[PDB]
Amino acid sequence: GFPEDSEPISISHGNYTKQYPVFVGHHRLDIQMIMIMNGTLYIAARDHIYTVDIDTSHTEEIYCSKKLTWKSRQADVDTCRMKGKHKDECHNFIKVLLKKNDDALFVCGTNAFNPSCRNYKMDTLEPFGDEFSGMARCPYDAKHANVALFADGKLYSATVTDFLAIDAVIYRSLGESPTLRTVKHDSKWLKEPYFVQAVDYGDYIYFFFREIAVEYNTMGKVVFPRVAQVCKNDMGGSQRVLEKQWTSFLKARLNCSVPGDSHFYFNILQAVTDVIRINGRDVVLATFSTPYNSIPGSAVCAYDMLDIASVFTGRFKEQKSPDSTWTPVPDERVPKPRPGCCAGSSSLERYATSNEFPDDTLNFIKTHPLMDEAVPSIFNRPWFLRTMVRYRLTKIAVDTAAGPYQNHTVVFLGSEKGIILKFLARIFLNDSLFLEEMSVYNSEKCSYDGVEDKRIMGMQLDRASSSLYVAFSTCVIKVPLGRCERYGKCKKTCIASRDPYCGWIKEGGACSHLSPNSRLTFEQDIERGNTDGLGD
Amino acid sequence: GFPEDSEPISISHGNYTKQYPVFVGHRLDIQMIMIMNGTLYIAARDHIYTVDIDTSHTEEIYCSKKLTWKSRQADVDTCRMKGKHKDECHNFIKVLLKKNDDALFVCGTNAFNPSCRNYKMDTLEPFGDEFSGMARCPYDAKHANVALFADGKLYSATVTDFLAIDAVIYRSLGESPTLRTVKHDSKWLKEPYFVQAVDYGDYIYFFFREIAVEYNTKVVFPRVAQVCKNDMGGSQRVLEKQWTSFLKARLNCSVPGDSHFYFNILQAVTDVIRINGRDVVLATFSTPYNSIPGSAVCAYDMLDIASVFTGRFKEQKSPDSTWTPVPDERVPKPRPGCCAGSSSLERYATSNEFPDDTLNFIKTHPLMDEAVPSIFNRPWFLRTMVRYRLTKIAVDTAAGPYQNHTVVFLGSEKGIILKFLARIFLNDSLFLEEMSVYNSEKCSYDGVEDKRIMGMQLDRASSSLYVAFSTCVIKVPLGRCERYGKCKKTCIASRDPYCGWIKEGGACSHLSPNSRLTFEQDIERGNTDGLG
Amino acid sequence: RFISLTFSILEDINIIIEIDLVSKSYKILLSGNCIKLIENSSDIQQKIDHIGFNGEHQKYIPYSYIDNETKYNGFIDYSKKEGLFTAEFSNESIIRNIYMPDSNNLFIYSSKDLKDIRIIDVKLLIGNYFKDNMKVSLSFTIEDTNTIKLNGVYLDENGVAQILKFMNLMNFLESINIKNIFYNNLDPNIKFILDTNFIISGQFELICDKDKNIQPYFI
Ligand SMILES: *[C@@H]1O[C@H](CO)[C@@H](O[C@@H]2O[C@H](CO)[C@@H](O)[C@H](O)[C@H]2NC(C)=O)[C@H](O)[C@H]1NC(C)=O
Ligand SMILES: *[C@@H]1O[C@H](CO)[C@@H](O[C@@H]2O[C@H](CO)[C@@H](O)[C@H](O)[C@H]2NC(C)=O)[C@H](O)[C@H]1NC(C)=O
Ligand SMILES: *[C@@H]1O[C@H](CO)[C@@H](O[C@@H]2O[C@H](CO)[C@@H](O)[C@H](O)[C@H]2NC(C)=O)[C@H](O)[C@H]1NC(C)=O
Ligand SMILES: *[C@@H]1O[C@H](CO)[C@@H](O)[C@H](O)[C@H]1NC(C)=O
Ligand SMILES: *[C@@H]1O[C@H](CO)[C@@H](O)[C@H](O)[C@H]1NC(C)=O
Ligand SMILES: *[C@@H]1O[C@H](CO)[C@@H](O)[C@H](O)[C@H]1NC(C)=O
Ligand SMILES: *[C@@H]1O[C@H](CO)[C@@H](O)[C@H](O)[C@H]1NC(C)=O
Structure with a gap:
């Protein structure tokens, strides 16, 4: 049978959570994301980006610390409306916020469907130079999802390049290195992807996203969760093949299923946490859900970075004939430099950089980006399951140092209806324990003009203040971890x-x-x- | 967006549903029930009870006539030797059909030795000698089978070998030759689970689910298969003593969305019922046992069920490849699946004589391309926020004093009954009542409870619904x-x-x-x- | 000379009547913010009908508003119940056609290299864009969401010798990146077609026939 949904040890309704501090304004905000650097808390919103000092004060109402202002020029608000988008959509929505170095800040906004980025100082929140182009680094529409990550001084991003959001691409620039992008209009690499998160581990960058499955085309359009690796020292292909394109881009399907006679797969990836050490194993946690036109259900799976790194050393899958079953390519036919290993690594010392990769290997990885095997989750079963509720789990935050002695594991889950789920994951079968479930949305301070949007935009755990900041479209709430x-x-x-x-x-x-x-x-x-x- | 589960207008908890009469005649282990000529028959282990429907006012109900048929010691000993459990080795009646107005036809497992015997209706005596019941009655009482008399012919669907590997559809008696599906293999049947057969016009339709052949990556899809009533088998060279009209088609019970979500596990299908001028059968579907629990009720028009078999067939252009529709130009002149002696078929006297190419084609292309579309292309009923799966289904097309109301009753694997008012011009369904009828007091035995519903039979003469459990039979009046x-x-x-x-x-x-x-x-x- | 009797239908909306004694046949013009006059399309159409606008005496309604670093000019065609608005910005030009009823967006095109787009038989747009030092001007008219009729291409600064003499039909267009500058919203794909009477003039005048080869016209 199917595992039953465990009962919450305690339940907290809005009646009790109506006392937690809320950011609010001090007009709409259209908050996009939240991240924490040191003791500062940055709230990326429409036309603005606020800062909150976490280590200071506990007043019932959260007051902003510094307020950065960046409004789109009138000459740009008009050129966006003329194109066809709604007035409400032609503003400067901040969709990229990363730390460039010890004192700089890297901020990109939609800027009325015209992406443009700018460098800011951390101590004074003031512009640091001219606005360079934002193409392939920040999406046009604030409704779209985008990923950005700084690694070894370079900027890795994944979003859409065109106004119509048809040409989704993974991009890299600003790293004193040449720019790289996936093959334009190549469905074998990306088929209408939806990017979620990227993490930096070892010599690779891993992109987690969902896309229309290419191997599961018999049924029709089905969305499959994917993980994609790119070498950090990639410098593009030769002058003739894969010039200004990735030479190490490989992808593989994420396996988050309950093993049985006929497995049940959760396909809609929702969120992925950063690399977090847990029981001496570098692991990332990811939430998966059922499609929108199916029975609502959600699952949390954990993946060991060693297993991820090991699935990209296996065999590739291809179509021997069009409209046929996908079969694993035998190793005896793959040329022997391994497609996907970074130049200068073990057994590849003879290749200085990616530019010296033989033509045949570049062609092979251009036509065979998908790995045969699927990434196996820890214990081959989801750590957590909810199937008797109407909401869908989205965001996920993990505290790998929770408790008095800092040797527990508490995972916080958000939902599309504003409900927070908390369970004590254990690390060797894991029994698990669904600790609590709570509704954090505060209609009194978050509703705007009789409108209720409960989609959680981000969750950031602050271990120093024992609090969890949950950001909504119109408000940010400081929820205590303990209650x-x-x-x-x-x-x-x-x-x-x-x-x-x-x-x-x-x-x-x-x-x-x-x-x-x-x-x-x-x-x-x-x-x-x-x-x-x-x-x- | 996914449709939310409607709220039950009325709920009856287990505490209230204890007054309703309960029949317990030891471990009964009922197999099925059925009402005939105003009289309810109780098919159970080694005994057949006949509750008198006429005595509706009587709160107590006692089996007026008890049929006794126990397996012989030799057969019981053989079953025990072969390795079956001592409890499983018993005479479990699994087939009960009306042969004629003065005869009763009963088949039992007879402790893993299928055998049938004719019984008189009035006196209830062994009217005739018995005979082997191989391929007509299953071996294991846990397995499901279908049997349906039509024009003095017995269509059955079950397993022939003790190992339950060779599933077969059969036809015996009636001065007609014996016909069966291709022994073993997977072209026609790949581990099917038979549910129900219905008689409509000149085609017998079998409803079942089986291992999907189209999905190489193992999924079970629901199927409906037709056979010609007057089929006489193939020629001496091809399809000798085999079916010549066996075709099957996928059942489409899904919620139209961005990506279609199909309910694949067929649970039960009602007989042909005239509703709103159109001849329609209702079918219950559930999600797989290893999936999120959910159930759906779809209705199918017999006209659409006939029309799908007139479309294109399915075929594999190359081995290990996606299935593609057979080109219309490549079909033999006499269309496979049409019965001899019908329209545009005067030349072929009977199914016995056909062209060998047609027979080979229908033996290599049994699956139709198109799927049977449901009425309104959306399920009439949905439950997705419960742990149980809807199973049995009874429909009353003559409900109300004006006899123009259609009320559908749905059983569950946990003993809960669901009642909704199906409206047929498409409108939302109306959940009328949900109630748990399992009477733990009178039905539990040795502290063991099995709430799985084994059958539901609606009786318009007493305005009641008899719900049979493995240990008891409960007479539930319609509604509350x-x-x-x-x-x-x-x-x-x-x-x-x-x-x-x-x-x-x-x-x-x-x-x-x-x-x-x-x-x-x-x-x-x-x-x-x-x-x- | 010319008396411009004006008045206001609504806030920030003004009508410019062009009356000339010699002509003795007053005209009507539109003047206001393009964005405001592209949403209240239903309201403006009603007012125009209510003010006794001549049904067929005027064929096209000229509109040309002047705003800082912008040049919103266009003409609404009363007969077809459509409209053409053109916006020339500091770095890109926008050409959009919206159906007057229900404010339905038939098709919206945009280009980053076209500048100072002027409006002229049937009125047609003209525009100049220089990829390099040489200046190239092309005339066009978009009929359907996926098809563009680019009849004429005026060359200047000895452009004919610079490029035409070198190659001496679609390959030439691809080489000069005509497709690249034209960005079509609401549709990824785009098709190019040529008018039967299309001619290219730079003095040398040429006009290709049905075949891909391009012969000359006058020299
Ligand atoms: C996803 O992971 C599950 C983990 O169980 C895989 O299920 C195993 O599949 C292999 C071959 O398909 C069997 O030999 C194992 O017995 C299965 N596991 C269990 C516990 O039964 C499943 O195949 C994976 N899905 C993929 C790789 O697509
Ligand atoms: C975290 O560590 C503490 C000690 O640092 C653990 O507490 C002890 O656990 C052991 C069992 O391994 C008990 O025998 C001791 O009595 C505990 N000491 C106490 C409670 O003071 C604690 O169990 C650890 N938590 C884990 C492993 O989840
Ligand atoms: C099952 O039925 C649904 C609905 O009747 C089918 O969905 C239709 O699919 C076609 C193309 O595949 C579309 O043109 C229709 O618009 C769809 N219907 C609706 C209501 O949107 C589905 O294809 C059927 N599946 C099978 C296997 O027959
Ligand atoms: C919360 O407050 C509302 C106010 O209308 C009340 O109806 C509800 O019962 C309360 N819930 C509790 C006290 O759990
Ligand atoms: C935290 O602040 C200190 C001093 O204010 C600074 O040196 C340090 O770099 C900050 N932390 C990070 C991660 O930059
Ligand atoms: C039904 O039962 C009644 C009385 O039990 C009997 O008279 C009648 O003949 C039966 N019907 C048929 C068709 O035999
Ligand atoms: C059944 O017929 C009666 C006759 O008047 C009518 O009132 C009633 O509405 C009918 N039932 C339905 C469901 O239409």
């Missing part, structure tokens, strides 16, 4: 909750947030919560 | 008029055609087929006027 205050004087509940961030203190006499290095003696039962002899 | 009792508000809110408010007595009560008293019921909407 110990709700339990209060009910020791029976404080122990039965089995919450790592909480505990019981006889000195104070109440349930309260537990500091990582709190000399006060705490009582908790994370292993097994026995309420016998206490309550109610 | 007695529940509401005297109050009229809730009765007008439930909008159940089977319940009405009497004007003379001033109390809500169940309706009758013909009554002089006036009726009060607002079908379109209930405003709860005069709320108490």
Whole structure:
């Protein structure tokens, strides 16, 4: 049978979460994303980007620290409306925000369907130079999803190049290196992809996205989750083949399924966390969901970076004849430099840079970008499952150092309806424990002109302040990680909750947030919560 | 966007549904029930009970006539030796059909030794000698089979070998030759699970699900297959003693969206029923056992079911390749699947004589390209927020005092009954009532509970629905008029055609087929006027 | 000389009547912000009908508003119930046709190299764009969302000798990147067609026949 959805140990409704601090304004914001650098919290929004000092103050209302202003020129707001887009869509929506170095800031905005980037100082939030072009680095439409990541001084981005958003591409520039892009109008590389996240690991950059499956074309248009690697030291192909194109781009399907007689695959990838160490294994967690025109369901799978790096060393898959089953290419026919290994690595020392790759290998990787095997998840089964709810899990944040002794693993999940799910992943079959479920949306302070958009735009965990910042389209909420205050004087509940961030203190006499290095003696039962002899 | 599950207008918990009569005649292990000539028959282990439907007022119900047929010690010993469980080795009746107006036809497993015997209707005695029942009755009571008499001919679908590997569709008796599907192989049947057969016009249709041959990457798709009633087999060289009209087509029960989501596991199919002028059969579909639990009810017009088999066939242009439609120019002149003696077929006297090329074509291209489209191309009913899967389905095309209401009843694997008002001009369905009927008190045995519904038979003469469980048979009256009792508000809110408010007595009560008293019921909407 | 009797239908909307004593046949012109007059299309059409606009005495309604670093000019065709608006920006030009009823966007084109687009039988657009030091001007008229009628290409600064003498039909267009400058919104693909009477003039005048080869016309 199918695993049943576990019951939340505790439930927190909007009635209780109506007291958490909310950013709001101090008009709409159209918040796009949130990231944390040191103690500063950056809120990327329409025509603006705010900063919040996390280490300062706890007032009921969050007040902005510094406010950067970047409005599109009138000469550009008009040239966007003339094209056909709505007035509401012809503004400067910040869709790229990365740290360039120790003091610079790299910010790109849609700028009324005309992407343009600009460098900013971190200490004074002021422009640092002229606006260079934003093509292939920032999307045109604020509704689209885009990825950007700085690695070894270079900028890796993935978005659409054209006004109509038809030519999606992965791009690289600004790294004192030549620019590279995927083959234009080549469905074998990317077929209407939807980029989600990119991570830096070892000598490769991994892009996680979903796209129309090329091998599963018998049924029709089906969306499959993919992971794609690109070497960090790639410098393009030769003058004749794959010039200004990737020479190490390979992709493989993500396997997030419940193994049985007939496996059930979750295909719609929603979010992917960065590389996080967990039980001595570099691992990334990813949330997958069922298609929009199917029964609602969501699953969280974890993937070991070693398994990811190992799936790109396997055999490739091809179509021997058009409209036929895909078969794994035998190794005896692959030329022997391995397609996808970075120049100057083991057994490839004879090739200085990618420019010296033989023509035949460039052609092979141009016509065979898809790997045969699928990336196996940890334990070959999803870590978490929800199938009896109407909402769809999207964002995911993980705390690999949660608890008093910093040896737990707590994963936070967002949803398209504003509900936060929290479960204690264990690291050797993992029993798992769905700790709590909570509605964080605050209609009193987030609704604008009687409109309710609950889609979570981002989640950022702040271990220093024991808080989790959840950003909505019109507001940002500071949700405490522990929520110990709700339990209060009910020791029976404080122990039965089995919450790592909480505990019981006889000195104070109440349930309260537990500091990582709190000399006060705490009582908790994370292993097994026995309420016998206490309550109610 | 996906359609949300409608809310049940009325819910009856298990606590309330204990007054309803319960029949327990030891472990019964019922196989199926069926109503005939106003009399309910109970097919179960080594015993056939006949509850008297006429005594509806009687709260208690006792088997008037008990049929006894126990396996011989030799057969029981053989079953035990071969390795089957001592409990499984018993005479499980799995086929009960009406041969004629004065005869009864019964087949039982007979402890893994299929055998059939004719019984008299009135006296209920062994009217005739028995005979081997191989390929007519399954070996394991857990397995499902179909049997359907038509024009004195017995069409059956089951497994022939003890290992349950050789699934076959069969036809015996009636002074006609024996016909069967190609032994073993996968061209015609690849591990099928038979559900129901219906008789319509001159084509017998079998509903089942089987391993999809189109999906190389193992998925089970629902199929409907037709056979010619007057089929006489192939020539002496090709298809000798085999079917010459076996064609099958995919059933399309999906919610139109960006990407179609198909309900693949067919659960039950009702007999042919005249609804809204059109001849239609209703079928229940569920998601696979290793998928998110969900169920759907789709309806199929017999006209569309006939039309799909007149389209293009399926074929593999090359081995290990996608399936493509057979070109229309390459079909033999006598269209495979058409029965001899019909239109444009005067030349061929009977199915016995055909051109060998047609026979080879229909033996190598049994699957039709197009799929059977459902009425309105969308399921009539959907449940996606529960753990159980809808199984059995009963339909009443003569509901209400005006006999123009169509009420559909749906069973579940957990003993919960679903009732919705199917409206046929397309409109949203109306969930009328959901209720759990399993009477744990009278049905549980040795603290063991099996809520799996084995069958549902609607009886218009007593306005009741008999729901059979493995350990008991529960007589569920249609709806729950007695529940509401005297109050009229809730009765007008439930909008159940089977319940009405009497004007003379001033109390809500169940309706009758013909009554002089006036009726009060607002079908379109209930405003709860005069709320108490 | 010319008296421009004006008035205001709505906020920031003005009508410029062009009356000349010699002609004795007043004209009507539009003047306002293009963006505002491209959304209230239904409202403006009603007012025009209400002010007793001559049904067939005027064939085209001229519009030409002047704004900083911009040149919004166009003409609405009352007979076809359509409209053409042209916007010349500091770095790119926009040519858009919106159907007057229901404000339906038939097809919107744009180019980054066209500048100072002027409006002229049937009125047709002209524009000049120089890829290199040499200046090349081409005349065109887009009929359908996927088809462009580019009849004439005026060359200047000895362009004929610079390039035409070298090659001496579609290959020449591809070489000069005519397709690249034309960016078609609402459709990825684009097709080019030539009018039967199309001629290229730079003094040398040439006009290709049905065949790909291009013969000359006058010299
Ligand atoms: C996704 O991962 C599952 C993990 O179970 C794979 O299921 C295995 O499939 C292989 C061959 O298909 C079998 O030999 C194993 O027995 C299966 N596992 C179990 C537990 O039964 C599944 O094939 C993978 N899907 C892919 C690679 O597309
Ligand atoms: C995290 O580490 C602490 C100690 O640093 C663990 O607490 C001890 O766990 C062991 C079991 O391995 C018990 O025998 C001790 O009594 C515990 N000491 C206490 C509670 O003071 C804790 O279990 C670890 N958490 C994990 C592994 O999840
Ligand atoms: C099952 O039925 C659905 C709906 O009847 C089919 O969806 C249609 O697909 C065709 C092209 O494949 C479209 O032109 C129609 O517009 C679709 N219908 C709707 C309502 O959108 C589906 O193709 C069918 N599948 C099979 C295998 O027969
Ligand atoms: C939350 O407040 C609303 C206010 O209308 C109330 O209806 C609801 O019952 C409350 N939920 C609780 C107290 O759990
Ligand atoms: C944090 O701040 C210090 C000083 O303000 C700075 O040196 C350091 O680089 C900052 N952290 C990061 C990751 O840049
Ligand atoms: C149905 O039953 C009644 C009485 O039991 C009997 O008289 C009648 O003949 C039966 N019908 C048929 C068709 O035999
Ligand atoms: C059945 O017929 C009666 C006769 O008047 C009518 O009132 C009723 O609406 C009909 N039922 C339906 C479902 O239309």
